[PDB]
Each structure stands twice: as structure tokens, then as C-alpha cells.
Write an enzyme that holds these catalytic residues in place. Structure first.
Site, short mmCIF file in Angstrom:
data_model
loop_
_atom_site.label_atom_id
_atom_site.label_comp_id
_atom_site.label_asym_id
_atom_site.label_seq_id
_atom_site.Cartn_x
_atom_site.Cartn_y
_atom_site.Cartn_z
N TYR A 186 3.20 10.10 0.57
CA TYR A 186 3.93 9.64 1.57
C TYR A 186 5.43 10.00 1.12
CZ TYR A 186 -0.07 6.53 2.76
OH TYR A 186 -1.23 6.05 3.29
N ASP A 242 0.84 -1.43 0.17
CA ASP A 242 0.12 0.02 -0.07
C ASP A 242 0.87 1.21 0.08
OD1 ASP A 242 -2.66 1.24 0.56
OD2 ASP A 242 -1.65 2.33 1.73
N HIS A 298 -7.40 9.11 -2.46
CA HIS A 298 -7.08 9.11 -1.06
C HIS A 298 -8.13 9.85 -0.03
CE1 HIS A 298 -2.85 9.03 1.00
NE2 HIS A 298 -3.84 8.82 1.95
N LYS A 341 -2.59 5.92 -4.54
CA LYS A 341 -3.93 6.87 -4.16
C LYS A 341 -3.47 8.12 -4.84
CE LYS A 341 -3.87 4.48 0.38
NZ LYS A 341 -2.39 4.46 0.80
#
Ligand SMILES: NC(=O)c1ccc[n+]([C@@H]2O[C@H](COP(=O)([O-])OP(=O)(O)OC[C@H]3O[C@@H](n4cnc5c(N)ncnc54)[C@H](OP(=O)(O)O)[C@@H]3O)[C@@H](O)[C@H]2O)c1
Ligand SMILES: NC(=O)[C@@H]1C[C@@]2(NC(=O)NC2=O)c2cc(F)ccc2O1
Length: 316
Positions: A49, A44, A111, A78
């Protein structure tokens, strides 16, 4: 039980995946390599990030080494909030693909339901500190996600942090082409999500549980906050089963027919967290764990509570 769940696009998704939020870029390549070596087949990811390049290095090396074939991996990313505009969705997806060194994603999620002003900043602010919204709604962003399927960039599309009314809005979209395959939401014994899970599953949408361990490394953690990993009742269930507390916390959503994505960059824990297919929680254990709900969220997106599409005012 079985390692994969069938999605409403006809593909199978591994019920255990490796989370990567907060995985430092200098550690996440080895984390993903170790994960694949010890059996993980689902990672994931997310552009926000900031570590997708490093995740991708690991994926590419394991494909090159022939530890795994691409068809055996299930890679999720996402679409960040600053890319909800229909003219930005493809490029956002393509940047993620390029960083992950993939030609397709298995699953691409919106997201959050909240769109923000596009630009360099992931949380664009007005001079008073409010996050600046986009006027693009969840339905036009969804149409842009559908186009990615039709271009071969992604095999499945889904949503994340959508409340039941927002899921419904997509399901009721005029001209809907593809239903969401997944809704990825926070879920653990302190936020059991009983109402939203039931709704999504009734509609054939698979739910992925995030922060299943209660995200002890979340940057806003406070000493006083409840701690799943240290909760002696949960510890007691783990001891009874001769498993770790984390292993109970991972097995719990699995037995609710959820996918679960614990994060670690610690090799020993990566391996620990995968050894969850060799025991069963009883129904009494399941009911007991569910009884610990207190509607406690890791991820409340607290800077965005006035956004029109903020998801967590609604009961569910
Ligand atoms: N869609 C969304 O908006 C959203 C939001 C939140 C999370 N997510 C996804 O869900 C993933 C998981 O959630 P999360 O990262 O918030 O937290 P989490 O998986 O609940 O917890 C991660 C923390 O637990 C520690 N840990 C892992 N395994 C452990 C074990 N066996 N024993 C003890 N401690 C252990 C990790 O430490 P070490 O890493 O130091 O080992 C890290 O500090 C994320 O990484 C991300 O992929 C998505
Ligand atoms: N909200 C976020 O995604 C980041 C996460 C994080 N960034 C990161 O790489 N690891 C982290 O926990 C972080 C670290 C901080 F000290 C303060 C805010 C913060 O926010």
C-alpha cells in the site's frame, strides 16, 4: 455482540478494523488518529500500500498520547508477493515493523498465494507483460512465516486470498507448526463466499472480510459495475433499521462471525463505520443479503491468471 473474536493462537482480534489500501499518505495519518480516537483498535495495513510509514506515525502518536496502550491495538500487515523467498520474509516483516514503528505485529498475512520474482517492482513483468513468478511454494513461505512467530516479530500468522484447496494445502503441510489464524478474503453481498467461509470456520480459521463496501474507489471501477452502496434493496434494509447502507454492509459480516475492515479517510465516515454495535440485522435480513451474491470480485488479480497459484480459477 462482542468486540473481539478469539483466534487459534489464543489472542483476541477486534472484529472491526480500519482498512488502509488507497488511503493517501497525506491523509492516512489523520485517518488512523481519528479512528483510534473514536474507538478503532485494529488497523489493516500492507507494505504494497506504500503508506505504512504514515500509518505508523499515527499509531506512535496515539501510543505516546496514551489514548491507547500497545496491548490494546491489533495491527495487521501482509507479506508482498515479491518476498515469498525464505531469505526475504524476515526482512520484509522487519521493514513493515520499522515503518509502522512497532516491535511486533499482531497478525502477519501472506498477501496472496502467488509468489513473484524478487526485486524493486511489485509486479515484475516479462517483455510480453506477464508477471514473472517465483518458484518458492506456499509451504516454504509458510515455514518462513512460522519462524517469525518463533522470533517474536509477530503474534499470529495467516493468509489472504487463499482458496479452499490452498488453505487445505497449508493445513496438510508436513510438519505444520502453526495453523493460519486468519484467511482475509473479499466478502460482501455480491461475493458472499459461502463455501470458503464455512470451510475456514470449520477448521478454526477466522475469516476477515475485505472490500465490504464494494471498494467504490478501486482504480479499475467502471460505471456499469454493480454498486452495493447504491443498491436500493440494501438501502431499504438500512432505512428499516435507521442506519446507513455502509453500516448495514459492515454489520452483515459481523453477524456471520467475520472480522471486517472498511476503509475510509473521511473523518465522519470513519466514525459512522464504527457505530455498528448498537443494532441487529434479523436472520431474514441476513438471508436476504446473502441472496444478493453474484460472484462479483473487486480484486481478481487479473494480471496473474496464469500463475500456478492463482487462487480464483477454483470454484472456492
Ligand atoms: N488482502 C487483500 O488482498 C485486500 C484487498 C482489498 C482490500 N483489502 C483491505 O480491506 C480494506 C477495505 O477494502 P477496500 O479499501 O477495497 O474498500 P471498502 O472498504 O469496501 O470501500 C472503501 C471506499 O468506500 C468509501 N466509504 C467508506 N466508508 C463509507 C461510508 N460510510 N459511506 C460511503 N462511502 C464510504 C471510501 O471513501 P473515503 O475513504 O473517501 O471516505 C472508499 O472509497 C482495504 O483498505 C484493505 O485494508 C485487502
Ligand atoms: N492497484 C493498486 O493498488 C493501485 C491503487 C491506486 N494507487 C493509489 O494510491 N490509489 C489507488 O487507487 C491506483 C491509482 C490509479 F490511478 C491507478 C492504479 C492504482 O493502483
Amino acid at each position: 455482540m462482542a468486540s473481539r473474536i478469539l483466534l487459534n493462537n489464543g489472542a483476541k482480534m477486534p472484529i472491526l478494523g480500519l482498512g488502509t489500501w488507497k488511503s493517501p499518505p497525506g491523509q492516512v495519518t489523520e485517518a488512523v488518529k481519528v479512528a483510534i480516537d473514536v474507538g478503532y483498535r485494529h488497523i489493516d495495513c500492507a507494505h504494497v500500500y506504500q503508506n505504512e510509514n504514515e500509518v505508523g506515525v499515527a499509531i506512535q502518536e496515539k501510543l505516546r498520547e496514551q489514548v491507547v496502550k500497545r496491548e490494546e491495538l491489533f495491527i495487521v500487515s501482509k507479506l508482498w508477493c515479491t518476498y515469498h523467498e525464505k531469505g526475504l520474509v524476515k526482512g520484509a516483516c522487519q521493514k513493515t515493523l520499522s515503518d509502522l514503528k512497532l516491535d511486533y505485529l499482531d497478525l502477519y498475512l501472506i498477501h496472496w498465494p502467488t509468489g513473484f520474482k524478487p526485486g524493486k517492482e511489485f509486479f515484475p513483468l516479462d517483455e510480453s507483460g506477464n508477471v514473472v513468478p517465483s518458484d518458492t511454494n506456499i509451504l516454504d513461505t509458510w515455514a518462513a512465516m512460522e519462524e517469525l512467530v518463533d522470533e517474536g516479530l509477530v503474534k499470529a500468522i495467516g493468509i489472504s486470498n487463499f482458496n479452499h484447496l490452498q488453505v487445505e494445502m497449508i493445513l496438510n503441510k508436513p510438519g505444520l507448526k502453526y495453523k493460519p489464524a486468519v484467511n482475509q478474503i473479499e466478502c460482501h453481498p455480491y461475493l458472499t463466499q459461502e463455501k470458503l467461509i464455512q470451510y475456514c470456520q470449520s477448521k478454526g480459521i477466522v475469516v476477515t472480510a475485505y472490500s465490504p463496501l464494494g471498494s467504490p474507489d478501486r482504480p479499475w471501477a467502471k460505471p456499469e459495475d454493480p454498486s452495493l452502496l447504491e443498491d436500493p434493496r440494501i438501502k431499504a434494509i438500512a432505512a428499516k433499521h435507521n442506519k446507513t447502507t455502509a453500516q448495514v454492509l459492515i454489520r452483515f459480516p459481523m453477524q456471520r462471525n467475520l472480522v471486517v475492515i472498511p476503509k475510509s479517510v473521511t473523518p465522519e465516515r470513519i466514525a459512522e463505520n464504527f457505530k455498528v454495535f448498537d443494532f441487529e440485522l434479523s436472520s431474514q435480513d441476513m438471508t436476504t443479503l446473502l441472496s444478493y451474491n453474484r460472484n462479483w470480485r473487486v480484486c481478481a488479480l487479473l494480471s496473474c491468471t496464469s500463475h500456478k497459484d492463482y487462487p480464483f480459477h477454483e470454484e472456492f
